Amino acid sequence: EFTVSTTEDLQRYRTECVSSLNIPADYVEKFKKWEFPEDDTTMCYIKCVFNKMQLFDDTEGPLVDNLVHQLAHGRDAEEVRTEVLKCVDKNTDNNACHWAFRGFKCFQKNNLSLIKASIKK
């Protein structure tokens, strides 16, 4: 049961993660603008959202198949997969928040986005 997350899913997951992690209001407003400071509050927020999107498991780490489904946005699955796998590492400091964010950073660096406009004809 993997389905891709939309904008609406992300807004929901954001609300859930904000409240469950008691995110201060300064951060909330940044996260609504998709602005992510590299600090521990943000790293657990990102883990939390990825968990809910089924992109990240705290034990297994980044979930490649689901990430490929989410991040392809119509692109060649095989090519998106090889890029994703370059972003996948091990839980070196045993901190799943740090682990999720590291993946996030690599994705953004490689221009893989969770959400992308879709044109349909």
Author numbering: 2 to 122
The authors write:
Ae. aegypti OBP22 (AeOBP22) is a member of the OBP family of proteins that has been directly implicated in regulating these feeding behaviors. AeOBP22 is unusual in that it is expressed in multiple chemosensory tissues, including in the antenna, the proboscis of the females, the thoracic spiracles, in the male reproductive glands where it is transferred to the females during mating, and in the salivary glands. The monomeric forms of AeOBP22 are similar to other classical OBPs which consist of six α-helices stabilized by three disulfide bridges surrounding a hydrophobic pocket. Our results provide evidence that fatty acids are likely natural ligands for AeOBP22 and that the binding of long-chain fatty acids (C15-C20) is enhanced by a conformational change in the C-terminal tail that is critical to generate a high affinity binding site.
The second crystal form was solved in the P31 space group and contains nine molecules in the asymmetric unit arranged in a pseudo three-fold arrangement of “trimers” consisting of domain swapped dimer and a separately packed monomer. The dimers are identical to those observed in crystal form 1 and superimpose with an average pairwise RMSD of 0.47 Å. The individual monomers superimpose to each other with an average pairwise RMSD of ~0.2 Å. Ligands are observed bound at the center of each monomer with residues 112–121 forming an α-helix that forms one edge of the ligand-binding pocket. No ligand is observed in the dimeric components. In this form we solved the structures with palmitic acid (C16:0), palmitoleic acid (C16:1), and eicosanoic acid (C20) complexes. Saturated C16 binds weakly with KD ~690 nM, however, introduction of a single degree of unsaturation at the Δ9 position (C16:1) leads to an approximate four-fold increase in the binding affinity (KD = 175 ± 41 nM). Dodecanoic acid and palmitoleic acid are strong oviposition attractants in Ae. aegypti, whilst the saturated C14–C16 and C18 acids are attractants at low concentrations but repellents at high concentrations. Therefore, we conclude that the domain swapped dimers are an artifact of the crystallization process, and further discussions below are confined to the structures of the monomeric forms.
